[PDB]
């Protein structure tokens, strides 16, 4: 028992991280088979940033401009290509440690582990979620770019994110591994606002089930509610509307704990209307919406990879 | 920018994790060179737990009783030995992936990453701290035992913890890698209380510096205080007394942020006396004492391993 924020192990992704230099700018890249992926903004200077034409900035580059270092091993680029906002670099050697893997585009609310890298070298690891505004509350210094977000399904590593930008708010935007941005963001140094950051209601609810399971259950309440009724109170506290599909998802928790979904929605509502009044749940003095149903399952079942 | 709880990468420790069966009971062990370390309570049955004599439970064991599985590779035990509350198993093969490593015994307040394992297989990773009561707020299901806590110093992996027990509170106790328990705990199923869990003041202060650095600075206060004065207010809020050595440690933060230690101690005091009154710091609605000065440095500097 006990409950914490925890990431999948990094191990598998560590051996896919490489350093990529072009011009001066060096950042991180990801090496799978005979391809190294990275943010295309590696070809830009601090000036190009303000309004780059990537197509045209790229014509003036050739394979040999792109230095790719695997610790000390220098890989030869024998081809290159821009896919959306990523660059794909054909290289001579295939990665001996390439795991099973896939490129996924997660839905908002979905969580993933992030291995933060500086200069191809991984500095640390943490879990975060694709916030409803399509940002993420990460920790990314300069040099962090091209670091990635991933899930693991026993063997298979799912790549959901590649890091590109920081926003005025101290939050981050980035791409799937096909290089399309989550949200409306562009890889340019222009003014860009997040949008309204809402709470992932379904994830909050699971966090409650996890609480129950761990014998933090004081916030349980005799009241029940209806779906429509509860959403009225959600919308007003800026909570993502809750669908039938969200309830479905919370079924196995619901079953296990003996607490009906809507009774848990009742208990939540009263916490919105009445705050936490000082107390803590699982040590957190606020509500935590960066845990999927699945995350909770995993951690209250002890799954491995 | 941004700030999160993040662990070192696991990678290096993953390749040292193995499964150890004796009797029925299987748990995790750690394989360095030609030795596999694990909690000695692997030789016990659910009954032995209530009051085992380990010496005598052990005489009736021999090398072949101890099954050690590295994925599928079965290692041959050619020797065994009890060190305090751990068992050391001489085996035929040395671990090809053994990194540089050391056995450390951390001080209370010190943090470390934990890679939680079930059946030699690592399920996930999180950071936690040796609480002043010598417990840790972990997430450990049955089968988690022998999972370990570690730091990394570029190359060198420092082993600070091996997991053994859960306590009535949903908290955990365990050993250094020489097998001595942190705190007064014993590997037996008897009644054991944590003791008073105090807050790691010095770590809180660094978390504030990290806040400042990230432009959460509302809690900054014109007042200053004295060391003796502030401790009076600490003791009463159950905060670890603050030494000169703690101030020393907070120097480089102090310098960088331009905020004197005692001015930060002033700002803290008022947060004790006045609560957070609703607001959040770095998204946390309480004070976070599971970040070392060093942790903060690392994350606001981008160090790698
Ligand atoms: C990345 O470029 C990197 O690590 N390069 C070596 C990364 C670094 C950021 C600094 C702090 N945390 C980070 O994520 N991001 C940027 O530098 C990006 C590059 C992308 C192509 C734009 N970057 C550059 C310039 C300006 C911005 N941001 C803004 O203009 C905001 C005001 C919206 C930016 O994100
Ligand atoms: C560990 O034994 C394991 O994983 N074995 C396969 C581990 C499992 C715990 C269950 C939930 N989280 C855990 O950490 N710990 C125990 O089972 C320990 C073993 C040590 C030798 C005692 N254990 C066994 C029996 C009873 C207790 N605890 C208590 O009696 C408390 C009431 C103090 C215990 O920790």
XYZ file of C-alpha atoms and ligand atoms in Angstrom:
680
model
C 0.000 0.000 0.000
C 0.832 3.699 -0.155
C 0.378 5.758 -3.303
C 2.758 7.995 -5.221
C 3.396 9.580 -8.605
C 5.689 7.112 -10.388
C 6.970 6.650 -13.914
C 7.584 3.505 -15.896
C 11.310 2.542 -15.865
C 13.508 4.470 -18.311
C 16.085 1.785 -19.106
C 14.529 0.960 -22.496
C 14.325 4.601 -23.669
C 17.785 5.599 -22.307
C 19.414 3.407 -24.977
C 17.489 5.277 -27.697
C 18.622 8.765 -26.679
C 21.319 10.542 -28.739
C 22.766 14.033 -29.148
C 22.121 15.956 -32.371
C 24.082 19.057 -33.395
C 23.358 21.305 -36.381
C 24.847 24.738 -36.674
C 25.708 25.566 -33.065
C 22.399 24.370 -31.592
C 22.720 20.901 -30.056
C 19.724 19.022 -28.585
C 18.458 15.454 -28.007
C 17.290 12.944 -30.611
C 15.748 9.476 -30.550
C 17.402 6.608 -32.358
C 15.213 3.720 -33.466
C 16.544 1.213 -35.975
C 18.414 3.243 -38.604
C 16.528 6.531 -37.968
C 17.120 9.379 -35.505
C 14.166 11.627 -34.773
C 14.442 15.167 -33.446
C 12.692 18.579 -33.456
C 13.311 20.321 -36.793
C 14.204 23.561 -34.946
C 17.764 22.216 -34.606
C 18.532 23.899 -37.966
C 17.537 27.326 -36.599
C 19.597 30.094 -35.018
C 18.294 32.292 -32.185
C 17.292 34.749 -34.918
C 15.690 32.209 -37.264
C 13.398 31.377 -34.318
C 11.358 34.557 -34.676
C 9.846 33.474 -37.986
C 11.605 30.558 -39.746
C 10.690 29.143 -43.129
C 11.742 25.582 -42.358
C 11.607 24.380 -45.972
C 14.052 27.081 -47.015
C 16.229 26.859 -43.887
C 16.528 23.152 -44.694
C 17.505 23.287 -48.387
C 20.826 24.822 -47.262
C 21.481 21.771 -45.067
C 22.964 18.443 -46.151
C 23.550 15.139 -44.401
C 27.038 16.147 -43.194
C 25.722 19.270 -41.430
C 23.991 16.962 -38.951
C 26.268 15.622 -36.229
C 24.774 12.722 -34.278
C 26.653 11.426 -31.244
C 25.796 8.254 -29.339
C 27.956 8.827 -26.281
C 31.144 8.786 -28.389
C 30.067 6.666 -31.356
C 29.430 9.095 -34.211
C 26.680 7.862 -36.512
C 26.823 8.696 -40.201
C 23.734 10.360 -41.661
C 23.032 8.932 -45.104
C 19.685 10.660 -45.584
C 17.360 13.202 -43.969
C 13.748 14.278 -44.142
C 11.316 16.668 -42.459
C 8.066 15.202 -41.150
C 5.740 17.940 -39.922
C 7.755 19.489 -37.055
C 10.265 16.666 -36.667
C 13.325 15.714 -38.602
C 14.046 12.077 -39.451
C 17.719 11.260 -40.051
C 18.533 8.053 -41.919
C 21.855 6.805 -40.497
C 24.220 3.959 -41.390
C 23.843 1.892 -38.178
C 20.601 0.526 -36.704
C 20.213 0.909 -32.934
C 21.207 -2.424 -31.273
C 19.011 -1.552 -28.265
C 15.911 -0.505 -30.266
C 13.032 -2.077 -28.238
C 9.601 -2.963 -29.500
C 7.908 0.386 -29.910
C 5.070 2.345 -31.503
C 4.148 5.947 -32.213
C 0.937 6.883 -30.439
C -0.991 10.118 -30.249
C -2.544 10.225 -26.766
C -5.882 11.821 -25.941
C -6.000 14.826 -23.550
C -6.107 13.457 -20.011
C -3.821 10.528 -20.875
C -0.596 10.269 -18.871
C 2.940 9.277 -19.827
C 6.464 9.107 -18.424
C 9.020 11.635 -19.596
C 12.758 11.060 -19.600
C 14.398 14.474 -19.584
C 17.672 14.586 -21.466
C 20.500 17.080 -21.854
C 23.020 16.380 -24.640
C 21.750 12.867 -25.402
C 22.278 12.058 -21.712
C 19.179 11.396 -19.508
C 19.023 13.540 -16.374
C 15.878 12.112 -14.817
C 12.356 10.830 -15.189
C 8.836 11.867 -14.182
C 5.193 11.245 -15.109
C 2.888 13.912 -16.516
C -0.332 14.207 -18.496
C -1.595 15.789 -21.701
C -3.583 18.579 -20.037
C -6.961 19.439 -21.680
C -5.341 22.615 -23.081
C -2.722 20.387 -24.781
C 0.170 21.529 -22.621
C 2.052 19.596 -19.924
C 3.343 20.623 -16.520
C 6.925 19.537 -17.035
C 10.436 20.466 -15.964
C 12.498 21.426 -19.006
C 15.633 23.582 -19.095
C 17.442 24.689 -22.229
C 18.956 21.668 -23.936
C 15.947 19.544 -22.927
C 14.379 19.556 -26.394
C 13.743 16.296 -28.209
C 13.420 14.489 -24.885
C 10.395 12.181 -25.115
C 7.238 10.956 -23.437
C 6.436 7.279 -23.374
C 4.307 4.463 -22.022
C 5.219 0.797 -21.715
C 2.910 -2.210 -22.296
C 5.078 -4.986 -20.833
C 7.548 -4.985 -23.743
C 6.165 -2.427 -26.218
C 7.253 1.221 -25.723
C 4.676 3.744 -26.938
C 6.019 7.139 -27.944
C 3.490 9.876 -27.323
C 5.554 13.066 -27.052
C 8.627 14.906 -28.201
C 9.486 18.142 -26.414
C 9.848 21.467 -28.269
C 8.671 24.596 -26.465
C 8.224 26.384 -23.176
C 5.249 28.755 -22.872
C 5.011 32.032 -20.865
C 3.408 30.160 -17.983
C 6.319 27.793 -17.242
C 4.556 25.000 -19.174
C 5.558 23.015 -22.235
C 4.267 22.055 -25.691
C 5.458 19.398 -28.115
C 4.704 16.808 -30.753
C 3.762 13.212 -31.276
C 6.510 11.200 -32.959
C 4.997 11.935 -36.383
C 5.748 15.533 -35.435
C 2.247 17.016 -35.187
C 1.810 19.359 -32.253
C -0.628 18.644 -29.500
C -2.872 21.692 -29.325
C -2.679 24.710 -31.683
C 0.979 25.520 -31.070
C 3.636 26.315 -33.687
C 7.437 25.925 -33.497
C 8.166 29.673 -33.655
C 9.062 32.403 -31.140
C 5.716 34.232 -31.310
C 3.181 35.057 -28.598
C 1.178 31.943 -27.710
C -1.353 31.484 -24.909
C -2.209 28.142 -23.319
C -5.989 28.526 -23.127
C -8.168 27.587 -20.144
C -6.588 24.707 -18.202
C -9.391 22.463 -16.989
C -9.305 19.567 -14.529
C -9.459 15.947 -15.731
C -12.505 14.890 -13.759
C -12.358 11.214 -14.602
C -8.731 11.076 -13.407
C -9.659 12.835 -10.167
C -12.327 10.215 -9.503
C -9.851 7.371 -9.885
C -7.489 9.144 -7.488
C -10.354 9.000 -5.000
C -10.862 5.281 -5.531
C -7.120 4.940 -4.903
C -7.659 6.925 -1.700
C -10.455 4.685 -0.517
C -8.294 1.678 -1.324
C -5.566 3.103 0.921
C -7.900 3.926 3.809
C -8.200 7.645 3.197
C -12.007 7.575 3.030
C -13.151 10.501 5.220
C -14.373 12.405 2.154
C -16.932 9.651 1.426
C -20.459 11.014 1.531
C -23.953 9.624 2.034
C -25.232 11.744 -0.869
C -25.406 10.457 -4.402
C -25.921 12.589 -7.519
C -26.929 12.349 -11.172
C -24.661 12.707 -14.184
C -26.296 15.883 -15.538
C -26.572 17.369 -12.051
C -22.893 16.743 -11.291
C -21.659 18.232 -14.596
C -23.487 21.494 -13.829
C -21.327 21.752 -10.697
C -18.260 20.594 -12.675
C -18.439 23.078 -15.561
C -18.621 25.841 -12.943
C -15.434 24.591 -11.192
C -13.823 24.164 -14.625
C -13.939 20.401 -14.738
C -13.932 18.413 -17.973
C -17.508 17.135 -18.617
C -17.944 13.472 -17.638
C -19.274 10.984 -20.198
C -20.822 7.541 -19.953
C -17.526 6.315 -21.402
C -15.743 7.787 -18.361
C -18.078 5.865 -16.045
C -17.544 2.679 -18.004
C -13.819 3.215 -17.528
C -14.236 3.659 -13.762
C -16.309 0.447 -13.527
C -13.618 -2.002 -12.208
C -12.617 0.532 -9.569
C -16.293 1.094 -8.783
C -16.791 -2.661 -8.470
C -13.718 -3.356 -6.367
C -14.268 -0.578 -3.815
C -18.031 -1.199 -3.618
C -18.597 2.535 -4.296
C -20.847 3.455 -7.218
C -19.476 5.973 -9.680
C -22.212 8.537 -9.012
C -21.730 8.192 -5.263
C -18.088 9.018 -5.836
C -19.271 11.952 -7.993
C -21.458 12.988 -5.075
C -18.473 12.894 -2.670
C -16.411 14.959 -5.141
C -19.056 17.662 -5.703
C -19.156 18.316 -1.955
C -15.368 18.706 -1.953
C -15.729 21.329 -4.714
C -18.483 23.155 -2.848
C -16.790 22.843 0.573
C -13.075 22.622 -0.229
C -10.749 20.328 1.715
C -11.116 22.510 4.768
C -7.497 21.810 5.789
C -7.419 17.995 5.527
C -5.337 15.996 3.056
C -6.052 13.048 0.765
C -3.118 10.762 -0.003
C -1.013 13.579 1.438
C -2.144 16.040 -1.250
C -3.867 19.226 -0.056
C -5.565 19.595 -3.456
C -7.261 17.266 -5.924
C -4.905 15.383 -8.258
C -6.065 14.875 -11.822
C -2.838 13.427 -13.263
C -3.680 9.761 -12.603
C -5.565 7.627 -15.138
C -7.920 4.840 -14.025
C -5.282 2.558 -15.543
C -2.484 4.228 -13.614
C -4.350 3.443 -10.419
C -5.054 -0.141 -11.453
C -1.345 -0.650 -12.176
C -0.250 0.731 -8.847
C -2.920 -1.095 -6.824
C -2.133 -4.410 -8.557
C 1.648 -4.186 -9.058
C 1.988 -4.740 -12.823
C 5.455 -5.039 -14.388
C 7.091 -4.712 -17.828
C 11.564 25.889 -16.184
C 8.755 24.133 -14.334
C 9.373 21.913 -11.327
C 8.345 18.347 -10.568
C 9.175 15.320 -8.442
C 11.510 13.242 -10.625
C 13.752 10.242 -10.120
C 17.140 9.455 -11.568
C 16.856 7.037 -14.548
C 16.435 3.362 -13.626
C 18.226 1.756 -16.575
C 21.382 1.009 -14.557
C 19.530 -0.612 -11.621
C 17.042 -2.565 -13.816
C 19.910 -4.792 -15.001
C 20.775 -5.620 -11.373
C 17.297 -6.804 -10.380
C 16.612 -10.558 -10.045
C 13.956 -12.861 -8.599
C 14.770 -14.950 -5.521
C 12.654 -17.900 -4.365
C 13.103 -19.875 -1.143
C 10.404 -22.121 0.187
C 7.287 -20.732 -1.488
C 8.080 -17.064 -0.804
C 9.546 -15.350 -3.872
C 10.756 -11.718 -3.812
C 13.314 -9.419 -5.497
C 17.097 -9.478 -5.136
C 19.982 -7.329 -6.347
C 22.789 -8.844 -8.363
C 26.161 -7.119 -8.269
C 29.233 -8.938 -9.535
C 28.941 -12.518 -8.258
C 26.633 -11.685 -5.299
C 22.843 -11.391 -5.021
C 21.508 -9.425 -2.076
C 18.018 -9.806 -0.648
C 15.994 -9.512 2.596
C 16.685 -12.540 4.811
C 12.923 -12.962 5.423
C 12.763 -14.957 2.169
C 13.472 -18.091 4.262
C 10.368 -17.491 6.409
C 6.816 -18.793 6.107
C 3.755 -16.704 7.014
C 3.962 -18.380 10.429
C 7.715 -17.953 10.931
C 7.044 -14.211 10.524
C 5.486 -13.855 13.966
C 8.768 -14.511 15.759
C 11.552 -16.058 13.626
C 14.967 -17.100 14.866
C 16.797 -16.370 11.625
C 20.001 -18.183 12.609
C 18.064 -21.383 13.216
C 15.675 -20.953 10.269
C 18.807 -20.618 8.135
C 20.801 -23.671 9.283
C 18.108 -25.823 7.618
C 18.765 -24.061 4.299
C 21.491 -24.868 1.775
C 22.633 -23.262 -1.456
C 20.228 -25.335 -3.591
C 17.176 -24.166 -1.611
C 17.731 -20.702 -3.082
C 16.388 -20.279 -6.604
C 17.647 -17.148 -8.355
C 16.177 -16.254 -11.738
C 17.497 -13.538 -14.042
C 14.579 -13.367 -16.449
C 15.121 -16.989 -17.538
C 18.827 -17.452 -16.824
C 19.036 -19.462 -13.604
C 22.108 -18.545 -11.578
C 23.806 -21.188 -9.467
C 24.323 -20.325 -5.803
C 27.730 -21.554 -4.678
C 27.645 -19.911 -1.257
C 25.372 -17.935 1.069
C 25.635 -15.721 4.112
C 23.458 -13.582 6.381
C 24.537 -9.983 6.933
C 22.368 -8.304 9.558
C 18.897 -8.424 7.939
C 20.055 -9.204 4.407
C 21.183 -12.366 2.753
C 24.182 -12.384 0.413
C 24.205 -15.199 -2.156
C 27.514 -16.043 -3.821
C 26.659 -17.218 -7.358
C 28.683 -18.685 -10.227
C 28.245 -15.818 -12.741
C 29.145 -12.149 -12.207
C 26.573 -9.625 -13.440
C 27.686 -8.362 -16.908
C 25.711 -5.136 -16.340
C 27.023 -4.426 -12.807
C 27.626 -0.618 -12.883
C 29.962 1.345 -10.683
C 28.223 1.366 -7.332
C 28.545 1.880 -3.581
C 26.614 1.081 -0.426
C 25.639 4.258 1.388
C 23.663 4.858 4.544
C 21.777 8.130 4.009
C 20.956 10.619 6.748
C 17.282 11.340 7.609
C 16.060 14.016 5.209
C 18.147 12.648 2.324
C 16.227 11.625 -0.798
C 16.639 8.738 -3.226
C 14.958 7.097 -6.210
C 13.200 3.785 -5.721
C 12.652 1.226 -8.452
C 9.732 -0.931 -7.370
C 9.996 -4.519 -8.522
C 7.695 -7.530 -8.584
C 9.320 -10.903 -9.352
C 12.690 -9.453 -10.389
C 10.799 -7.304 -12.911
C 10.684 -3.485 -12.361
C 7.175 -2.028 -12.353
C 8.041 1.640 -11.957
C 10.123 4.336 -10.350
C 9.642 7.230 -7.927
C 11.628 9.481 -5.580
C 11.177 9.520 -1.812
C 13.055 10.544 1.319
C 14.266 9.014 4.569
C 11.695 10.704 6.814
C 12.987 11.892 10.243
C 11.145 8.934 11.835
C 13.167 6.602 9.557
C 10.215 5.520 7.448
C 9.421 6.383 3.819
C 6.178 7.275 2.088
C 6.367 4.656 -0.629
C 4.100 2.504 -2.766
C 4.798 -1.168 -2.090
C 2.473 -4.119 -2.695
C 3.188 -7.707 -1.725
C 6.078 -9.012 -3.793
C 7.764 -5.588 -3.668
C 10.362 -6.613 -1.084
C 14.052 -6.353 -1.887
C 13.340 -3.530 -4.324
C 15.950 -0.814 -3.739
C 16.595 2.880 -3.262
C 19.439 4.550 -5.076
C 21.182 7.746 -6.097
C 23.419 8.318 -9.103
C 26.575 10.493 -9.248
C 27.104 10.619 -13.023
C 28.311 7.006 -13.264
C 28.379 5.739 -9.663
C 25.127 4.216 -8.303
C 24.731 4.616 -4.540
C 22.551 2.043 -2.816
C 20.821 3.491 0.214
C 17.792 1.249 0.770
C 16.385 -2.229 0.491
C 12.672 -2.661 1.149
C 11.337 -5.030 3.839
C 8.219 -3.939 5.716
C 4.946 -2.072 5.616
C 3.799 -0.392 8.846
C 0.201 0.098 10.127
C 0.149 3.597 8.663
C 0.646 2.615 5.000
C 4.363 3.488 5.257
C 7.491 1.415 4.778
C 10.719 0.473 6.574
C 13.882 -1.149 5.266
C 17.638 -1.508 5.331
C 20.832 -0.124 3.924
C 22.652 -2.600 1.691
C 24.683 -3.844 4.671
C 21.268 -4.824 6.006
C 20.939 -2.544 9.042
C 17.484 -1.064 9.443
C 16.889 2.631 9.290
C 15.141 3.505 12.538
C 14.392 1.034 15.372
C 12.465 -1.477 13.276
C 12.859 -5.269 13.277
C 12.036 -7.807 10.534
C 9.220 -9.504 12.482
C 5.405 -9.365 12.469
C 5.048 -7.557 15.811
C 3.384 -4.255 16.700
C 5.606 -1.356 15.624
C 4.817 2.364 15.668
C 6.462 4.931 13.402
C 7.041 7.692 15.954
C 6.395 11.407 15.392
C 6.848 12.289 11.708
C 8.438 15.725 11.535
C 8.962 18.022 8.552
C 12.399 18.417 6.940
C 12.706 22.164 7.316
C 15.878 22.579 5.313
C 14.280 20.724 2.379
C 11.183 22.919 2.589
C 13.359 26.022 2.346
C 15.030 24.792 -0.826
C 11.606 24.063 -2.312
C 10.873 27.741 -1.717
C 14.048 28.839 -3.472
C 12.929 26.605 -6.347
C 9.590 28.429 -6.226
C 11.194 31.841 -6.388
C 13.335 30.622 -9.268
C 10.165 29.630 -11.134
C 8.337 32.895 -10.455
C 6.097 31.672 -7.665
C 7.241 34.359 -5.216
C 4.017 35.724 -3.662
C 4.895 34.158 -0.301
C 8.025 36.351 -0.062
C 7.881 38.595 2.979
C 9.479 41.849 4.101
C 10.111 40.364 7.559
C 13.336 38.654 8.476
C 13.897 36.476 11.554
C 16.652 35.000 13.710
C 17.717 31.368 13.866
C 16.688 30.808 17.502
C 13.465 32.761 17.015
C 12.483 30.736 13.942
C 13.178 27.352 15.594
C 10.791 28.231 18.440
C 8.055 28.539 15.802
C 9.358 25.404 14.034
C 9.429 23.025 17.012
C 5.804 24.004 17.658
C 4.775 23.132 14.057
C 6.848 19.940 14.333
C 9.689 21.026 12.110
C 13.187 19.570 12.340
C 15.454 22.135 14.107
C 17.610 24.107 11.652
C 21.392 24.187 12.111
C 24.143 26.447 10.834
C 25.101 23.494 8.637
C 21.637 23.674 7.038
C 22.171 27.366 6.266
C 25.594 26.663 4.832
C 23.936 24.096 2.585
C 21.330 26.623 1.410
C 24.056 29.193 0.616
C 24.304 28.755 -3.222
C 20.524 28.951 -3.480
C 20.569 31.956 -1.153
C 23.232 33.583 -3.322
C 21.606 32.858 -6.665
C 18.107 34.058 -5.747
C 19.409 37.097 -3.835
C 17.269 36.021 -0.837
C 19.037 35.574 2.497
C 18.413 32.323 4.320
C 16.832 34.000 7.352
C 14.579 36.087 5.122
C 13.396 32.843 3.587
C 12.937 31.522 7.150
C 10.898 34.639 7.855
C 8.665 33.993 4.806
C 8.196 30.363 5.910
C 7.272 31.168 9.532
C 4.442 33.392 8.296
C 3.175 30.525 6.133
C 3.113 28.317 9.257
C 1.313 30.966 11.295
C -1.071 31.957 8.465
C -1.364 28.816 6.334
C -1.532 28.990 2.540
C -4.963 30.540 2.743
C -6.040 28.742 -0.457
C -3.117 29.609 -2.767
C -0.634 27.122 -4.209
C 3.152 27.053 -4.550
C 4.542 25.090 -7.489
C 1.032 23.654 -7.725
C 1.241 22.099 -4.247
C -1.390 23.190 -1.709
C 0.941 22.199 1.148
C 4.643 22.558 1.897
C 6.884 19.924 0.290
C 9.818 18.690 2.334
C 10.950 15.855 0.039
C 13.417 17.924 -2.014
C 17.068 18.323 -0.993
C 19.000 21.525 -1.743
C 20.941 19.309 -4.151
C 17.775 18.000 -5.765
C 16.801 21.574 -6.525
C 20.249 22.463 -7.843
C 20.117 19.457 -10.186
C 16.714 20.344 -11.537
C 17.451 24.070 -11.903
C 20.760 23.361 -13.680
C 19.935 20.233 -15.713
C 22.641 17.794 -14.558
C 22.952 14.380 -16.233
C 24.475 10.950 -15.500
C 14.537 23.597 -26.826
O 14.650 24.508 -27.909
C 15.947 23.211 -26.368
O 16.138 22.629 -25.308
N 16.912 23.497 -27.232
C 18.312 23.196 -27.010
C 13.597 24.155 -25.725
C 14.260 24.782 -24.492
C 13.309 25.517 -23.551
C 14.031 26.436 -22.561
C 13.416 26.127 -21.201
N 12.626 24.927 -21.421
C 12.430 24.621 -22.693
O 11.628 23.793 -23.111
N 12.665 25.100 -26.346
C 12.935 26.263 -26.964
O 13.974 26.890 -26.840
C 11.906 26.678 -28.011
C 12.262 26.227 -29.429
C 11.027 26.169 -30.289
C 11.102 26.392 -31.769
C 10.456 27.414 -30.893
N 11.605 28.114 -27.971
C 12.425 29.001 -28.619
C 12.160 30.321 -28.630
C 11.034 30.813 -27.961
C 10.187 29.950 -27.326
N 9.024 30.287 -26.612
C 8.263 31.406 -26.769
O 8.469 32.221 -27.673
C 7.157 31.614 -25.752
C 7.153 33.062 -25.271
C 5.807 31.222 -26.343
C 10.470 28.530 -27.287
O 9.752 27.704 -26.727
C 7.654 -8.149 1.533
O 7.650 -9.166 2.523
C 7.279 -8.779 0.188
O 6.980 -8.091 -0.779
N 7.370 -10.102 0.148
C 7.085 -10.897 -1.029
C 6.793 -6.937 1.976
C 5.382 -6.829 1.384
C 4.496 -5.759 2.018
C 3.012 -5.929 1.681
C 2.532 -4.545 1.259
N 3.751 -3.766 1.112
C 4.832 -4.329 1.625
O 5.908 -3.770 1.809
N 6.741 -6.916 3.441
C 6.218 -7.828 4.276
O 5.413 -8.686 3.951
C 6.847 -7.851 5.666
C 7.984 -8.866 5.805
C 8.892 -8.487 6.944
C 9.649 -9.529 7.710
C 8.517 -8.803 8.359
N 5.854 -8.016 6.735
C 5.408 -9.270 7.062
C 4.523 -9.460 8.059
C 4.033 -8.364 8.776
C 4.477 -7.105 8.486
N 4.079 -5.909 9.109
C 3.562 -5.773 10.362
O 3.489 -6.718 11.152
C 3.052 -4.392 10.731
C 1.694 -4.502 11.417
C 4.062 -3.667 11.613
C 5.412 -6.882 7.402
O 5.843 -5.775 7.088
